[PDB]
Ligand SMILES: Nc1cccc2[nH]cnc12
Ligand SMILES: [Cl-]
Ligand SMILES: [Cl-]
């Protein structure tokens with residue numbers, strides 16, 4: 001395995017950190033590990049990003065910042081404000097994707113209607 005520090009350093013100093021990690025994953029690289037898994041009942045709302053763990057039976061709940069490429073790389077977030085959607089919150093990851101929470105949050109978008117992940121929880 002490359003190891004978390006080797007992967008995160010490679011992405012952090014890349015001109016495009018998101019593309020560096022996606023290309024690394026596509027190459028067969030081991031996902032970033034040591035995301036902070038939360039103790040929960042799996043009876044929550046199943047919403048994507050929440051003040052407290054909200055995993056349903058089809059999700060795992062994690063500490064938000066631990067699942068954010070930009071937080072883990074200690075680099076600026078790519079928006080005008082440099083605001084992080086995940087920091088200080090809990091993130092629900094479909095169990096089928098929970099081996100790679102950083103890649104999941106990087107690649108996916110929260111539905112502004114139901115507040116669930118588009119293409120997963122979202123039933124709009
Ligand atoms: N997705 C899940 C549902 C119920 C229990 C579980 N323990 C770990 N993941 C779980
Ligand atoms: Cl580590
Ligand atoms: Cl979901």
Ligand SMILES: [Zn+2]
Nearest residue numbers: 068070071084
């Ligand atoms: Zn972040």
Ligand SMILES: [Zn+2]
Nearest residue numbers: 111114122124
């Ligand atoms: Zn929706």
